Design a binder for this molecule. Structure first.
Ligand SMILES: COc1ccc(COC(=O)N[C@@H](CC(C)C)C(=O)N[C@H](C=O)C[C@@H]2CCNC2=O)cc1
Ligand SMILES: COc1ccc(COC(=O)N[C@@H](CC(C)C)C(=O)N[C@H](C=O)C[C@@H]2CCNC2=O)cc1
Lengths: 306, 306
């Protein structure tokens, strides 16, 4: 029993983090086989960052302009290239700790574990979701760039996020590991802002299922609803539409608890319309939307990873 | 910017987790140097667990009754002993991955990271606090016993918790790594219950400081209060007393934000008396009490560990 915000164990990723320095700019890199991946703005200066031309900036660099440190060992850079917004540094040494891994570009609503690092060294781990507006609500300070987000599918580390910047609202933006930003953002110091966000409906429902699995039942009711009337209520409260694909995805939790998805939707409708009336669900006084259906199954059924 | 529930990176602990089997009972163990530590109820059966006599049960066992698996490798047990509620198994192989480490017994209110494991394999990591009633609000299923809680001080893993059982309210109880329970609990299947809990005041204040550091200021006011009148309010709302040691501990956050501890106490008094009036603090509609002052400093100042 119990239900907590739970990250994947981070050891496999810890073995890959390095420090990358160029000029007076230091940030983190991901060392996999004989390549180090990092944010390309490491090659910038204060003058460049306002409106940099990265192809120019990279033409003017040489392998010796890049200092890469794995622990104390210095790694020697034998080549460099740019792929979208990530720099790839070929080094003379393959990381002996390289896990089995994949690069994946995730959809809004999916969660992942973030290993926050500074100067190549891990500071901590936490869970995040990709918001519908393609920001994440992270915890990042100066020097955090290059920290990565990941899931651990079965045996395989799936990297899905590398950190690049903080927006004026205090939320965060970054790229997949092939250097493409999530959202409309760009890697220069300008006046970009997050669009208005919405609540991830399929995840709120998953978390209500987690609450039932853990003995919280006070929000249940006898009613059901149709997908259409529910989505009308959702639109009114700034919730994402619920699709039939979402209902199918929620299948297994529905089956384990015996509560049909549309019955749980009737509960959610009532919670949106009347509030909680001073009660809590899984220790929360607000509806939580950063657990996916898979996260709930994983934690309530005890899946392990090696 | 940002503030998240943040666990320590778990790699150093992942390298120490093994599986221990005795009879048909399997749980997890902690392999450090040439000793494996695990809950002694692994030597029990359904008949024993109601009121076991562990000295008897252990006299009747032999080294070959204990199967220890590190990954796939089987470790050979060359000795066994009991220390309080933990079993210590001497094995023929020193763990080459043994980190620098200490065993510490923590005080109520202190937090730690839990690496939940099943069959010797890590499932996930999360943050917990030792509640004033010496339970933790964890996430644990059958087979979780032996999972450990830890902090990473500087270079050193400080183990402070090993998991043994779940109480009827769905909360959790366990021991320090020398096998002494936190709280009045015992390792047999009987009718034990958690006492009534209280809220960890020094931690709520630390989290209000985190909110200020991150731009949440709407709860501040011009007033101050005395320790005595505050503690009167605290008692009325089931909050722990605030000591002068707590005020001193909160020193650094007071200094970084310029808000005196007793001014922040006046804010907390008003929040207790009037509620939040539909607003949130760091994304929460309730006052959070599982961040210590050190946790706030660690996350808002970017301390790293190697
Ligand atoms: C210090 O306060 C702040 C400092 C800067 C900002 C907004 O500006 C940027 O975040 N620019 C990019 C760099 C550009 C070229 C993409 C950056 O600087 N990323 C950092 C990579 O290390 C991560 C930032 C650093 C601070 N918190 C973050 O997430 C907001 C607060
Ligand atoms: C299955 O439901 C439940 C199964 C059992 C209970 C209460 O009983 C115990 O937790 N007894 C101790 C064993 C005794 C001898 C200390 C145990 O069984 N610990 C487990 C060590 O692996 C951890 C438990 C297992 C379930 N969740 C936990 O935290 C509650 C729910």
């Amino acid at each position: 029993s119990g239900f907590r915000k739970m990250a994947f164990p981070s050891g496999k990723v810890e073995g890959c983090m390095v420090q990358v320095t160029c000029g007076t700019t230091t940030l983190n890199g991901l060392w996999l086989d004989d390549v180090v991946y990092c944010p390309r703005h490491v090659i910038c200066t204060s003058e460049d960052m306002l409106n940099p031309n990265y192809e120019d900036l990279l033409i003017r660099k040489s392998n010796h302009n890049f200092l890469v440190q794995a622990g104390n060992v210095q790694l020697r850079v034998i080549g460099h290239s740019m792929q979208n917004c990530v720099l790839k540094l070929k080094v003379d040494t393959a990381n002996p700790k390289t896990p089995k891994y994949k690069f994946v570009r995730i959809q809004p609503g999916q969660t992942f574990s973030v290993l926050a690092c500074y100067n190549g060294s891990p500071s901590g781990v936490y869970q995040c979701a990709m918001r519908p507006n393609f920001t994440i609500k992270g915890s990042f300070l100066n020097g955090s760039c290059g920290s990565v987000g990941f899931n651990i599918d079965y045996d395989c580390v799936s990297f899905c996020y590398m950190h690049h910047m903080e927006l004026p609202t205090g939320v965060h933006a970054g790229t997949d590991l092939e250097g493409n930003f999530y959202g409309p953002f760009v890697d220069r110091q300008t006046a970009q802002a997050a669009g208005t966000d919405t609540t991830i409906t399929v995840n709120v429902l998953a978390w209500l299922y987690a609450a039932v699995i853990n003995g919280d039942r006070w929000f249940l009711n006898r009613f059901t609803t149709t997908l259409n009337d529910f989505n009308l209520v959702a639109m009114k409260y700034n919730y994402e539409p619920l699709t039939q694909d979402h209902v199918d995805i929620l299948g297994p939790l529905s089956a384990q608890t015996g509560i049909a998805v549309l019955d749980m939707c009737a509960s959610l409708k009532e919670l949106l319309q009347n509030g909680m009336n001073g009660r809590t669900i899984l220790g929360s006084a607000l509806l939580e939307d950063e657990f996916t259906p898979f996260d709930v199954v994983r934690q309530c059924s005890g899946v392990t990873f090696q």
